[PDB]
Design an enzyme around this catalytic site. Structure first.
Site, PDB file in Angstrom:
ATOM      1  N   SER A 297      -7.168   2.741   9.256  1.00 26.78           N
ATOM      2  CA  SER A 297      -6.349   2.244  10.616  1.00 26.78           C
ATOM      3  C   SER A 297      -5.509   1.041  10.176  1.00 26.78           C
ATOM      4  CB  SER A 297      -7.017   2.422  11.627  1.00 26.78           C
ATOM      5  OG  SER A 297      -8.116   1.251  11.778  1.00 26.78           O
TER       6      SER A 297
ATOM      7  N   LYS B   8       0.830  -1.052   0.197  1.00 23.31           N
ATOM      8  CA  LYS B   8       0.115  -0.061  -0.135  1.00 23.31           C
ATOM      9  C   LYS B   8       0.604   1.180  -0.015  1.00 23.31           C
ATOM     10  CE  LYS B   8      -4.626  -1.546   1.530  1.00 23.31           C
ATOM     11  NZ  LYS B   8      -4.703  -2.835   1.606  1.00 23.31           N
TER      12      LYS B   8
HETATM   13  C1  LIG Z   1      -5.194  -3.582   1.111  1.00 20.92           C
HETATM   14  C2  LIG Z   1      -4.738  -5.007   1.191  1.00 20.92           C
HETATM   15  C3  LIG Z   1      -5.115  -5.934   0.060  1.00 20.92           C
HETATM   16  C4  LIG Z   1      -6.312  -5.518  -0.967  1.00 20.92           C
HETATM   17  O1  LIG Z   1      -6.164  -4.475  -1.726  1.00 20.92           O
HETATM   18  P1  LIG Z   1      -7.576  -3.527  -2.296  1.00 20.92           P
HETATM   19  O2  LIG Z   1      -6.792  -2.608  -3.106  1.00 20.92           O
HETATM   20  O3  LIG Z   1      -8.433  -3.022  -1.127  1.00 20.92           O
HETATM   21  O4  LIG Z   1      -8.258  -4.634  -3.007  1.00 20.92           O
HETATM   22  C5  LIG Z   1      -4.671  -7.249  -0.092  1.00 20.92           C
HETATM   23  N1  LIG Z   1      -3.702  -7.828   1.013  1.00 20.92           N
HETATM   24  C6  LIG Z   1      -3.101  -6.610   1.818  1.00 20.92           C
HETATM   25  C7  LIG Z   1      -2.265  -7.163   2.729  1.00 20.92           C
HETATM   26  C8  LIG Z   1      -3.661  -5.523   1.834  1.00 20.92           C
HETATM   27  O5  LIG Z   1      -3.119  -4.670   2.822  1.00 20.92           O
HETATM   28  C1  LIG Z   2      -3.128  -3.259  14.593  1.00 21.68           C
HETATM   29  C2  LIG Z   2      -2.372  -1.648  14.416  1.00 21.68           C
HETATM   30  O1  LIG Z   2      -2.228  -1.084  15.506  1.00 21.68           O
HETATM   31  N1  LIG Z   2      -2.751  -1.162  13.265  1.00 21.68           N
HETATM   32  C3  LIG Z   2      -2.570   0.387  12.941  1.00 21.68           C
HETATM   33  C4  LIG Z   2      -1.668   0.596  11.962  1.00 21.68           C
HETATM   34  C5  LIG Z   2      -1.551   2.116  11.630  1.00 21.68           C
HETATM   35  C6  LIG Z   2      -2.517   2.830  10.870  1.00 21.68           C
HETATM   36  C7  LIG Z   2      -2.182   4.380  10.716  1.00 21.68           C
HETATM   37  C8  LIG Z   2      -1.136   4.850  11.267  1.00 21.68           C
HETATM   38  C9  LIG Z   2      -0.303   3.909  11.684  1.00 21.68           C
HETATM   39  C10 LIG Z   2      -0.122   2.583  11.959  1.00 21.68           C
HETATM   40  C11 LIG Z   2       0.546   1.957  12.593  1.00 21.68           C
END
Ligand SMILES: *Cc1c(COP(=O)(O)O)cnc(C)c1O
Ligand SMILES: CC(=O)NCCc1ccccc1C
Ligand SMILES: *Cc1c(COP(=O)(O)O)cnc(C)c1O
Ligand SMILES: [Ca+2]
Ligand SMILES: [Ca+2]
Ligand code: NA
Ligand code: NA
Ligand code: NA
Ligand code: NA
Ligand code: NA
Ligand code: NA
EC number: 5.1.1.18
Lengths: 322, 317
Positions: free
Chosen positions: A81, A53
């Site tokens: 989040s 991402k």
């Molecule tokens: C976000 C995410 C997906 C799926 O991506 P989309 O664009 O929401 O379909 C798959 N695997 C992981 C680990 C992700 O973080």
């Molecule tokens: C499980 C957990 O703590 N997820 C939070 C992930 C996140 C989201 C947005 C900013 C920073 C972090 C680490």
């Protein structure tokens, strides 16, 4: 024709390449034996931030404008989040701008603390979407920020598509890519890329049967989001597809494979034990798909299959037993 | 100088085994670079067939050693090990189309027996004594026209393990040092022979648990000083002491030995899981812990490019 083009994916890869990893493609004799196929694993679990991402998030930070009158974003804001929020915070840090995560009061304490430790600012909202939207829009306007959607934002979709540029370059004889789908930002980006460059290569989606809106949408021929929040171990694909990713998926994705919770769990454990890769269960969805009964319907000509291992952001203590 | 192997033996092993093993990748980590101040390269033997590097020495032995019989090829392999060694030997036997027998005390738990059979070893029972274990293994080896293979002192095993360094030197041309976890020292010795033959300017550093510090003590004293009793360590794969065959190589050809505490091993192993997403076993955490240790911090900055062998990923989950 669609909300992104191949040109946008190339703009994205120019924009982000100095700050992301060209992740390796690994293989496994064992998984080859199990599936019948010649598998290749695109290791986005090794990407900066622990998932792919960062691609879309950094492209958004480097390409979106907050306003007609200001070319440079002064902050980033999201309701994600999870992996998207984490990636967006990293991207914001790279660009020297603050990140704001809009978080319901009901979020677990551990998550609230983690968000802060990573260097995002939390803005609290009510569990209500009305409040969520009020709060986030307000934050975005007040900070002169960009709101960056985890899967429907064109700049995000374009960034995720860069995975496919790497896969095609890294695996010249690839016959198909298998991609886990939630909101479909990654699937749509990849589909645009593959179909622009080498449409003979198949693009397959992998989805939990417990969260099967992409399957149901493709079946019905229209966008059918989950009616209710889905229950699945694949926590990263709980989003439904949306208005920007659906048309791409409808037109450019070859097939969708759904997998049970047990299939996801078993595939994830298989990757852990036999490949020694700490994938999150969401990234086990694509592996489950290729192992599934329905995947046997895929032509034997489709031999070389690259599966995207999309993330490695797992809490080990919790993943001791599901 | 002269040792139980030379580089010629490593080259032979390479030809013997390359068709059947993985040329494992070398991966990197920005965070571990930042923690150490070095350019680290991780040789990923956890991705090797059977989950550890031991298939290298095991396959080389199965393809090199001869039984006490008319026919030149082993007709079986016999082992005491249900660990990385035995699993490697069993896979080598499968590749060669011969049975692998594991000698097991009659009193062994059902779960252990199931685990052993899962990777395809055939169980032969013995009495729960070192006398019976030895005598049953001897009988089975002879009756099956098979071979046994020492986990770290067998020349064919030492030569096979050297092939790790052959690959590393190709994959990281500008490497300045290799860091290698040491138990019996088959891997360390094979690597040391290889590095010192091919590019002696490259440092060879060993890493061992401070709870099992025979290598360190031996190098300090200038003589083989085995652990006085079996050590307790999370690093289950390096409980063996160095032996008579590996010691002279390690004495002469290994630049330094870094010891690491149990906490350091545990923390390094966790860092690799969480930050690198690699399921290393704790024994493979030993070399990571070494490069993170205070003692390593003081290593000359000229030694910048450091390859750590992530030796295995066979951890119980
Ligand atoms: C976000 C995410 C997906 C799926 O991506 P989309 O664009 O929401 O379909 C798959 N695997 C992981 C680990 C992700 O973080
Ligand atoms: C499980 C957990 O703590 N997820 C939070 C992930 C996140 C989201 C947005 C900013 C920073 C972090 C680490
Ligand atoms: C066997 C083993 C070692 C140590 O090898 P020696 O040749 O006995 O020193 C290190 N790591 C792992 C994972 C092992 O299995
Ligand atoms: Ca879905
Ligand atoms: Ca020792
Ligand atoms: Na705006
Ligand atoms: Na490219
Ligand atoms: Na083809
Ligand atoms: Na649109
Ligand atoms: Na044993
Ligand atoms: Na020899």
């Amino acid at each position: 024709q669609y909300d992104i083009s191949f040109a946008d994916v190339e703009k994205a890869h120019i924009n982000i390449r100095d700050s992301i990893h060209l992740t390796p493609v690994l293989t496994s004799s064992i998984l080859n034996q199990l599936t019948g196929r010649n598998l290749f694993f695109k290791c986005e679990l090794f990407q900066k931030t622990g998932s792919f991402k960062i691609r879309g998030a950094l492209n958004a930070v480097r390409s979106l404008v907050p306003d007609a009158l200001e070319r440079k974003p002064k902050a980033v804001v999201t309701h994600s989040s999870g992996n998207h929020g984490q990636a967006l915070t990293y991207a914001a840090k790279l660009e020297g701008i603050p990140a704001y995560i809009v978080v319901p009061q009901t979020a677990p304490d551990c998550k609230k603390l983690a968000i802060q430790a990573y260097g995002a600012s939390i803005v609290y909202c009510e569990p209500s979407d009305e409040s969520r939207e009020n709060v986030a829009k307000r934050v975005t306007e007040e900070t002169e920020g960009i709101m960056v959607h985890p899967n429907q934002e064109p700049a995000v979709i374009a960034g995720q598509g860069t995975i496919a540029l790497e896969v095609l370059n890294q695996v010249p004889l690839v016959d198909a890519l298998v991609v886990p789908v939630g909101g479909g930002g990654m699937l749509a980006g990849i589909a645009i890329t593959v179909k622009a460059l080498k449409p003979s290569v198949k693009v397959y989606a992998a989805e939990p049967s417990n969260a099967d809106d992409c399957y149901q949408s493709k079946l019905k021929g229209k966008l059918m989001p989950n009616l209710y929040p889905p229950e699945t171990i694949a926590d990263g694909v709980k989003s439904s597809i949306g208005l920007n990713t659906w048309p791409i998926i409808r037109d450019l994705v070859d097939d969708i494979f759904t997998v049970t919770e047990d299939e996801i769990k078993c595939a994830t454990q298989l990757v852990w034990e036999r490949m020694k890769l700490l994938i999150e269960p969401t990234a086990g969805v694509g592996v489950a798909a290729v192992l599934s009964q329905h995947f046997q319907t895929v032509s034997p000509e489709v031999k070389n299959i690259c599966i995207v291992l999309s993330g490695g952001n797992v809490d080990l203590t919790s993943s001791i037993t599901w």
